[model samples]
Structure formats: C-alpha cells, structure tokens
Target: KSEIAHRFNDLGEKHFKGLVLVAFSQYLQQCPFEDHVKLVNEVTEFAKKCAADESAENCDKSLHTLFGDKLCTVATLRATYGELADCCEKQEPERNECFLTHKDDHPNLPKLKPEPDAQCAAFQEDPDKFLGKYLYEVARRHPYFYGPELLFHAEEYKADFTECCPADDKLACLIPKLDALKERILLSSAKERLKCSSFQNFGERAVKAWSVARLSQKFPKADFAEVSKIVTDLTKVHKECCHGDLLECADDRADLAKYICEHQDSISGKLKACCDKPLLQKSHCIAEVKEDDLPSDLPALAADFAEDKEICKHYKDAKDVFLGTFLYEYSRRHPDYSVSLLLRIAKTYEATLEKCCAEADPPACYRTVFDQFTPLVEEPKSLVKKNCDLFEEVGEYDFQNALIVRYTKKAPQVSTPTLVEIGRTLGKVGSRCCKLPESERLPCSENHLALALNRLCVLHEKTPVSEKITKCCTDSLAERRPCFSALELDEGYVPKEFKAETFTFHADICTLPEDEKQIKKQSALAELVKHKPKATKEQLKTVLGNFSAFVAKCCGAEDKEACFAEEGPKLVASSQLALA
Candidate 1:
C-alpha cells in the first residue's frame, strides 16, 4: 500500500537523522547517544506533532531553534521540500493552500514535562556550545595542533576530563555517566583500554586540538595563580608518586612564556596576570648575553666561526694572532660584508702578522667562502640548495654594478676579461636577486655598482691602455643592457633575445606545462634579462613572434600568420615593444 511505502521511507528518514545526530554528538562531545537522545527525540517529536496538526508556526519556530541561525537558510529549504511533498502525497482538495498555510498555527498537545534538573544541565545542553568550550580547554593544554591542524582538533572533551576530574567523582556533572558509557561502548573493557591508549600517534593531534580551542577563545589569559597551583600540584604528583616525566608540562609552561613574549605588544590591563611568572621573569633576568636569544649584529661572523675551515686552522696556529687578525677579518667581512666590513689595511696588518712570524705556515683559507661562492653562480642549484637568502639581494647588486661600471665608465678604465667576469658575476647576482626581499633591493644594486667602478679604476691604473680600455667599456655597456633586461630594469620591457627564444623550446623553470600557459613572463624575470647583453630586441621579437605564430598555426586556425602579426614587427624592434 502507499501508506506502507510512505511509512517505510519516513522510517528510513528518521533512522538517518537519528544516526547522524548520534554520531555528530558522539564525535564532538565524546558522549553516548542514549545520554543525549532525549534532546534529539524532543526535536523529532516536535516536528512530527507540527506536521500532524498542520501547524506551520510551530514547525518554523522549532526548526529555527533546533538549527541555529547559521543553518536557518538550509533548514528553510528542507521545510519547503517537505511541505510540497506532503501536499503531493495527500492529494489535498487545495494543494497550494495546504503547502503554504496551516489552519491551526499552534498545535494543542499534552503539557510538556518539566525542565531537567541542574544535575542534568550539562547533559541537556547543545553539544555545539559545550563541545566548543571543551575543545578550547584541550587546545590550550596541548601543542601538537599549534602548527596548522589546530583548526579541526576535537580533543577538548577528553583533555578536560583528564585535567578537571580524572577520578570517578559523582559530584562531577561534567563527566558522562561512567556506568552507561562503559556498557554502551562499542568495545569491551580490556579491548577498549588496549586500543584507547590516549597518547599514541594522536598525542600531537590532542595538542593541536587544544591549540585550536585556545585560539578560538581569542587567546584568553588564564589566571597565573590558578595555573601555578595546578602546575605545582601536577609537578609534585609526578615527582612523588606518578613519575610521569613532566616533559609535556615543562614544555607547556615554556610555551606560555613564549606566547606572552610574542604578544607583549598587545597585552594591556593586569598584564602581570599572565606575564608576571618566575619562569618568564628569570628567563629575562638572567642577563646571559645582553639580549640573549636575539641575533648578533653580525651573523656571518658567527657562521664563519661555525663552518669556516681556514678560520678554524688560523685559530689553531696562532691563538692570539688568529683571533685578533685574519680569523677576526673573516668573521667581520663574511656571513655578509655590510655588517662586519674589514678594511684592506686591517687585512694587511693580519697578513703581516702571519708572515712576520716566519716559524708558522700561512693559515689555510677555509674553503667555505670558495665553496659558498659557487652557489652564487649556479641559478637552479642555488635556488634549491641555499639555506638563507641574506646575500641573494646585495650580492647580485654588487655583481651587476661591477660589470656596468667597469665597462661604462671610460674616464676610469678597466679590462675586457675583468668586465666579462663582472658580467658573469652580474648574471649570478641577478639570479639571486630574484629571491631577495623587495625592501633590500635598490641599495644592494647601488653598492654592487660602486664595487665594479672601484675595480675598473684599479685596472686602469695598472694597464694604461686607452683603446683596450674603451673596448672593455663598450663590451660592458652592451653586455649590461641585456643583463638589465633580465633584471626587469626597464620596467615593462622584455628583451628581443627572450622573444626570439619563443621559437625554440627550453625546459620550463618550474616544470609547468610546456604550452603557452608557461609563457607569461613576470617583471622579475625581465629584470634578470635586462643585465644580459645576449638578449637584444631583435632576438626576442624573432623568437617570441615565431613561437606564437607556430602555436597559433598548430592549433589549425584559419589565418595563423595574421594572428597578432600587426604588432609583431614593432614588438621585435625594441625591448619596450617586446615586453608590451
């Protein structure tokens, strides 16, 4: 019968809703279905009563309350679908009226049972709000989720259970009925204990969940006095009887200290409530290194000491001289040049000290600088292998400026090979510059240019050959233009050589598809090309136009050659046109 079929479908619907609500409440609150089924049944019964009495108002109110405002939009859709289906099934005399309006807005029913007692308040509350509070507690107590996964961590209920009331206390309204939980659990007692060793692979997840809850609570400051008491009590328990290794507790305490330090800028009003702890205060008050933990003004110097072999050898030979001279210079001039610049005079003094001793061998120059220098040249290798990008910006500028100044400045002459060397250096520098912070750019470029000019001037004094010097200048000027193009020096201009290469295929830098999709050149790439003299306007236009034409024709277009041909020649003529 139709009645049997409709009842069967409705039964399935009830089962689905009931099952979903149970799983949802269980996963979210760690509570069993029977504990919270009264609430679910209350809603389902209200829905059934509203439908039977044809009470739209009661249905609407109940629907909105059961689902919070955020879900009201979806709930309305469900209401409309249910009403239409009901009308169709009934074959009512006035179908439209039946779907839209109910004769009795409020249904007459038996008086509702009294509200549950205060003892059952936690049990009766919506899982969303209560679970959210519990999740917040756990996330704050744990750190595994702090990195990224804290967003969906749901360990708050368990974490709060362990912390607030570990033992079976009847007074604990927070605890679910332990007897009921044990009986209804999917697993047997011994099996559940074996399986539910809470801190397995999920320890980190618990920490992450705790992080999520704390972050969701808008970083609420806990009362240090209360936290202190709890921590002290836990510490005592671990030492006297539990012997629980307190590592997590110690780490958590440290995390709080770090958190306060990071947020010190925004904390106000009773700031001492969180930050005024002996752990934090002692870490600050120790006066270990005059702002210990913060970086030294010269990190390169420190790195050289750490890894520079020559410096290490120098230290081994003449302890005082090594520390006072060449080793010192290495520290001062390296990691970076700007921070700890050592003058040539200082180097001369150190060298004199090393040579005058006569009894010792020349201290081996640690190959760190030499080994480190290669990365400054190879683009792809450096891009992947390099650790920090500190030198990437300034080192590039120095190389480019050296090439440009050595060739361009005729009055202050330089050499051809030297200019070429500078060009190559410029190329390497440009490659590194692609990754440097934007804020450090212009100054890095300027300093490099200055170094080039100084080097060229030194060569001029040595050779005294005007013609050879002029040739170097011209060669440098030519080479620099393309390098500058690579650097996107002309802003919008892409070089002709680059455009020419459009006709040819090269492996994609980022291993993107080898089609037209990869052809979009960014300003940074242009900047690099700007410094290379090899990429002229004619070259780029030829490559780019020919390639574009090839692609268009390959796709079987009606007039492949004519596609963008009008602007093709002009684009090939100049760097400006090529880029545009």
Candidate 2:
C-alpha cells in the first residue's frame, strides 16, 4: 500500500490516477478518503470508457450503480466536504480569508471536463471522440445544484460546434447524450411492476420517443427536433427524481402523463381550428394583377399570336390565354352558364352526336355538327337541364338568374369560331368551379366540351355587344370582363389545358405526404406490434393504422387525439389478436 501511494505521489499531475491520490490525501480528515476517492474515480473512468465505446452496455451498468447511489462508505462524502470546509475556517483564524487547498490533494475529475483534449491524463489518444459524452451524461444523470447541469453542458457543446462550423454543416453533437439517456431507462425495472395496460402504454410512448428521434431528419422544417430535446430532458428528470423509467415511477409517470394529456388537448384544439375551411377551398383562387409600366406592343404581339413561329409562338400562346380569361370570367358572372353544370349536360349529347355523324355519311356529319353546335348555340338547353338538377339538390332556385341561365338564353346566335372560344373558356370555368361546393364540382367530362364552348360563345357575344353598343370600349375596360361570376374565380384563369389536367393533378395534391410522422404515439405502437413476432398481418396493419392516425391527429394540438383515441380502441377491438 505504501509503495503504491508513493508511486501515485511521484506521478501526480502526470496522470488522472495520480491527481486522484493527492486529492484524497489532503481531503481524508473524515474517513478513508484514499479508498473512497479511488473508487469514485475508477467508476467514473469505466463509465467514460462506456461512453466512448460504440457499444455502451457497460456504461449503462456503471450509470445504474452510480445514479442509484450504490457507492458505499462515501454516502458520508458529502459530510466530509462540509467538515473539511469548517476545519479550514477554524484552523486558519489568523488569515482574513480562510480555505483548504484541495486542488493538489484532489485533482479535478477528468471525466467532468467538457473539452476532453484539455485533459491529458485520460482519453488523450482521442480526446474529442471520447471525453465529450462522458462529461455530458454524468452531468445529466444526477441532479446538480437543482436541475440537471447537463442541460447547460449540452448548450455549451452546441454553441462550440456552431462557432466551429458553417450553418449548413453543423453536426448534432447533442445526439450522444440523447442516446445515452434512452439506453439507460426505456423500461426501468420499476416500470415492469405496472399493470399490463400501463406497461403497454409506457411501452408505446417509449417507441414514439425513439422513432421521432430517428425520423427527425425526415422533416427538416418541422419542430420535432425541439420535441426530442424535451422528451430526452424529461427522461433525465425521471431518472433523477423518480425511480426507474416512467412506468416504474408511477406517481411521476402519472404527473407526466397528465401534463402530456393536457398538452395534447391544447394541440388538438389548434389543429381542428386550422382547416375549418372546406378542403375544396384550397383549390379556390383569387386574381391579382401586377402591371408593367412599360408597354409591350400587344397589337404586334397579337399578330405573332396569329402565327406559330419562334418567339411568335410564345406571344400567340400568351394572347390566347389573355383572351380566354375574358371569356371565362364573363360566362362565370352569368350564374346560368356554370362550367361544371354545363359539362354534365354535354355528356348526354355524346352518343346522339356520334350517331348523328357516322364517318360514311358526310351530309350526316355536317348536319350532326350543326345539330350539336346549334342547341349549345341557340338555347339554354344544356344549362337548363344541368342547372335545374343542381338547383333542386342544393335547394337554391336562384339558378334562373345565374350565369348558366343567361348563357342558355343567348344560345341561338353563337358562330363556329366563337363556339371554339366559348368551349375554351368553359374549360377554365370547370377547373375553377371544382374548388367550390363538392356537390357542384364537375371533375372531368368530355360532355362538358360542347357546353363549355357554348358558355364562352355567350360570354363573348354578350360582353362585346355590351361594350360596342352599350358603352364604348375604352382602355379602362378594354378586354376586361363585363360581368363577374356568382362564385369568385381563383386569381388566375384556368389554362386551356386545365380540363385535361384537373382530375389527375388533384389526386397528387390532396394526399398528405407519407413522411409526415406522429411521434407522440406511432413509434411506440410499432415497437409493440413488432414485439409480437407471431402477430397476424391484419393485426399489425390495424395497430399501425390506429397508432398512426392517433399520432397524426394529435400532432398540431394536444387533445386533438381524443377524438382519435376513441377511434383507435375501436380499431383495436375489431383487430384479430393472436399470440404464439
């Protein structure tokens, strides 16, 4: 023992163990400081090695022993530090400021140092790699002054890393501390004592914590990273003030669960309020115009629009779109000319039109074309049929004065060139109208083709006549729509191609992204379901679906999941349960 003590004295300041020895000698007034300090330092070193190793199972064992205060004899170590401080005051009465020099006698814990590189005694081989987590976890595992000091240390590490790297490249250095916390007590021995239901509940929460942490990278803009920090912090608190993991620490777990419940309630309230608007409203648009002060010769541009060459093609396309907008807007203003309703009526005429124009019969083809073109031209025929049905369904008979009714009235005088223009505008109207009442929505219809065109024909006829005869076409009203639709048009006109694209595009638009996660519950469920290696496929699917729905619904608000909670149990009740 003397020889070992002597060697330690010589090696002082050269290694961590040497510093421990000197510190013990000076601080030993209360008990066997030599033995106790040696043991604490040894435990700390082993814990640190566990932190450095990729497989940190050993570190978990060391933490369990230390955090549980299983260290013997030094339960009195606190009293010793008190006695030493008192002795120093009494003995050094001659000095104005009195204190014991404990630094040489008790070297700083190398494991407590944040900058591992600064401590040459241990982890000298790869200080950056080794000592950081050792320092962070120890600070986190025990209560200090009041709260876990690890929170401060974690921040310090974050600040240092941010200062060292660019914004886009910072590595999440706090990840190690989070990993250590999870490894320590997802299912503490105490949690094992809970009721089966309680155990299942905790197990589910554990899975959520793990999965959310894992998938944090999936949604870069979402605040799941911050949510992770909160859960990890709570785990540390549970380990410090409560026994075991959350389920084992029943009273604490209950308190936490209550808080979580309240939080979920709050979150749910906000989510329901979020999409109070109809889902279809997302497709509704408003118009905006930002005019360029500089005039680009539109007449010359219109000439190029008449041709399809070089930049002329783009000019022509732009002019066509501009003109089509006027036609659609005018037709929409007349409630009787609704693009959706008109399209539905056109479907009825399809077979008749085909029969009227068989390929071998040229005269029949010409007569059939006129027959199909004229009613759409002379009468409110299609609008009358579709509009009357829609009016009865919604119980809104104001359809008589609506845009569709007016288009029906003007159906007679429309020409072939004007018929094509009218068709183009109704295509735009159908695309825009779908954003309104779902019952009134007309998705895609070839039948809509003739009706859409005729509606535009009525719009062009009425608006130009109103301009030329009723009022002079001045620049203020030049090409501007004379009438606005009963329903507001989304800001931009529906493109000519919209009739072809509306049905397919919305399927992609309406589906929620699969990557969006429900952290509060889903992951925990996945873990439990996975635990049942013999679980049936349908059972797994239902569990996952219910869990997924619950988490998803709760994501934006707290109690938001309450409605979903009822849904989940029902799903579970209906699921086939199996065990091997």
Candidate 3:
C-alpha cells in the first residue's frame, strides 16, 4: 500500500498530486512507522514501470494498486472529485486551495461502526493504523476541513477508544464516545456546507456561466439581464438553502421543478417531460439543453394536431389524451407563445369541437374546428405592441408593481416570495428590451404582460365574462392582453341564486383536460339533484338514468353530436319530466 504511493510520489506529476496525497493520507496512516522507509523503496520501484511508459492513465493505474476497492478508493475519489477535475487542471498553489475548498459529497456513505473481530492487534501494532480507516471516512466526507481542525476529532476518538477499549464495560463506554464524535463531524459538515464562501461563490459562478451559455444560445434575442437573474435565482436558492440537513432534501429539489415548469422560458425548453422524469434522471436531462434534442419537427406535429386521426375512437377510450399530444405538439410548435396561450388554443379548439364533435356531421365539425385554430390564436403583432406600450407608458417600476397587484388578485394562494420573484423575473424581461428601438423591442418583450396575467385566465371565477375571458385569453393574444387590462376587479356584483344552470349538449365536454372533464361529469349529477332538491332518490335516479341512457345511445348513434345536441338537452330541459 505504502509502496505504490511512494512510487507515485517519486514518479507521478503534481497533476493529481493534491488529491493523491489527500487520498493517500488514510492508507499511509494505516502503515507502521517502522516499515515506512523500506515500503517507500518498494513503492518507488513498482511505479518505475508506470513512470517509464508514463501517462495519467498509467499513474492512475499505478495509484489504483494502492487505491482499489472499498470506500474512498481511487475510483470513488475520482467520482467524488468529478467536478473538482477542474481543480486538477488548474496551476499549482491555486489547485491546492481549490481542492481544499471542495468537500466530498458521495451519496450512500454509511455511519461508522467498529470492526467486530480481531481488530485489536492492528491498532496496537500501528496505533495510527487503527485510526486510519476511521479518519478516512470522517475526513474524506469533510474534505474541506484542514488537518488542524480534523486532527482534533482523530485525537479525541482515539483517546476515548484507548480509555474504553480495556474496560470491562467497553461496549457501554465506546458507544457514546463514537456517537459524540459523529455528532461533532455532523456539525463541522453542516457549518462548512452553509457558511463556506467558496462553495456558494463557485456554485453561483458555475450556474451563471452554464445558464448563459445554454439559454443565450437558444433564446438569442431573449432578455440577457433577465437571463442573468435566472442564474442568481438558482444561486439564491443554493445560498438560501441546501446541505443544511432535514429540510425536505427534496425541497430545493422541488424548487427546481417549480422554477423550470412555471417559468419555462428561462431554460428555453418547455421542460414538462424533463420535469416529470424521476429525480436523478430529471436533473441529469435538465443539465444539458441542446436545440437538436427538441421534439421540434413542427410541420409533422402540426398536421397531426389538426387531423381527426381517429379522434372519436381515442376520445371514447382516453377521455384524456391524444389531447395531451395536442397540447405538447402545439406548445412545441409555437415556442414563442406562453403556455396560457397554448392553453387558449386548446380550450378554444376544444370548446368549438366540444359542440362540433356531437354534431350530426362529426367529420366537418372536426375539420372546421381545426381550421378555426388559426383565427383563435393569431398571436398578433398588436398584442406584442400593446404589451411593449404598456411597459413604456406605465414605467418599468409601476408596470411591474401593477403586475404584482394583478398576480395577487389572481394567485392569492401563491406565496409573496414566489410572487415577488415572479414579478422581478417579468420586470427583467421588460427592462431587457422595452427600451430598444420599436422594430426590435416588440418581439423581445412579447408575452410577459400576458404571461404575468396567464395564471388569472385559469384561476378566474365563472362570471358572465368568464366565457368571454376564457374565449378572450384563448381567443386572441391580440385582444387578451387588452381583455385582462379592461378587466375591472369587480363588475357590479350580484348575489347568488339557487337555479341550476343549463348543461349545453356539446362534445366540447369531452375536449377538456382529463381531471377537469371528470369534474364536468360530476357537475351533471350534482346539477340534476340541484334541479329537484326535494325530489325522492328513486325519482332523481330515473332522470339521471334517462340522461345517461340517452348519452350512451347518442354516443353510439351515427349522429352522435346531433343526438347529444337535439335530444340530449330535451331530457335535461325539464328534470320534472320524470313525472311529467
């Protein structure tokens, strides 16, 4: 063991020497001081083969002879120091500090426990040898700690062990001492994890550089200062949190998910699929963003989107998806628009075909509704112009404050921190490009205004304008910005009444996203009961049975839309028809 490290020291470059020395610290400690001189000679000779035909690969191979197998092995050290591979590339004296600042973060390192068997001799023979394995795990886990700071732990543990090992009640004596040491290690690790300026600074630097390099490439004309803030946001999260212990380790993990999904423009990929992947895989995929990897064969997806493509067959079975593909494909197609707008297109097209699919001519309903997708969301130059003008007239501070006010009005449930962050993000967008010349500014500041208000479009009440606004947001990006702008917080309030609303017999019911439409189905039964609050169970059941029966027959009929439309409402029209 000492032999190989000795050879590497004699023959190996200072290339990985800092890590090599640190890695060798444990194994060297395990050897007896008496044999150290003779062992170095053996190590130097064995490494002669490596130095003669040398390469890092050979040195690495030479080191592995001493370093193989068990935790803190050469391979594991490489894995632990993966990012610190950069530290190795750096010039001399600077490299030592770089490696020193970085700590080991190997997952699955277990708590230290005593060797159960004949471990007594190894320690007595080489007292430091007994301590070697113990300190390696402890020291390596906290690679950032200096020998002076960490040596205290090694000294203390040995004293406690020496004090207890010979006692009759050794097991009782040793247990607490070991645990006390563990708690102390825990404290040092936590302290460095949070307080280390090197970690936070380097972490932020890496995040900023990578974010700009990737996102700036994709969103070429995007707001770079806004891009800069995205870096700060991710870094801010790390600075505010991480490695603190027991704060839902997945929490900062959860934060990443929220940031990527809600403000997808930051990463430039609508990372819905990326976010949905399992935790390890999710971060892995998100780390690298390349344009070619995008499912952006737009012309292909667009044709499939508008195609009837066995629409009724799948709609009957799924009542869920193909529309899932519809949203994904459409969102992928129009990367420039907001999800809210994509949603608008879906709902508008859904609402149209909701009735259209139930019509006597299902084919034309499908064809005609697909045709309407264009006018439904013109994504006009005027919408972009309108938003830019709003940013201009209102002043950046005031416009952003207005955005905050509107966000609260809508997402009352969202946290102030979340809303504030969102406000700052949108503000950076306006600041980025609104001051540019008119021709250039429009596309740059495009949908943040609508994007800011998008949550409201979904979170709204079922008001008279609910249908209009629903149509408005999904209708025209051109008008929806104005639609929201014109929205008075309260429009002449009216008290509630008990009358059940009419259910339109339209296939648009099926056009909704799955769980949303599930509620739609439930609304039917609830409204039937509401229609005849005093009616007996048997009587109400009969009316519902008739309604379901008619729907079943309608769905099966040659003119499913016609049946649902013409005959479907006639039954619901008079709930008392059960008796009448």
Which of the numbered candidates is closest to the native, going by highest lDDT?
3
Model 1 over residues 1-580: C-alpha lDDT tens digits? 2221222234344332333243223222322334334444554554455556543454434221232221122223344345434444443234423432321111222222222243235533554444443333322222111211121122333343334343454345444443233222211211111112112212322222222221212222323233333334323322211111112223333454455445544322233444555543332221111111212332344354424435535655775444333333332233222210122223333444345344343333332333443332244233323312423534543333433432323222223344544444444445644455653333234324333433343344345555543343334321222232233222232233344443232223323443223223212223323434344433443444454444444334454345435444443345334434
Where does model 2 exceed 4 Å of error?
Answer: 1-14, 17-72, 76-533, 537-542, 556-561, 576-580
Distance (Å) between predicted and true CA of 468, model 3?
14
Local accuracy by lDDT, each model:
0.33, 0.31, 0.47
Clashes of each: 46, 45, 7
Give TM per candidate.
0.20, 0.20, 0.30
Q: Which regions of candidate 1 are displaced past 4 Å?
A: 1-337, 340-352, 359-565, 573-580
lDDT of 3: 0.47
Tens digits of per-residue lDDT for model 3, 122-228 = 65677755664455556445443332234445667778777876777766787777767776665444333422332443355333333343344333333445445
Clashing pairs in 3: 3-43, 344-474, 354-507, 354-508, 355-508, 358-561, 359-561
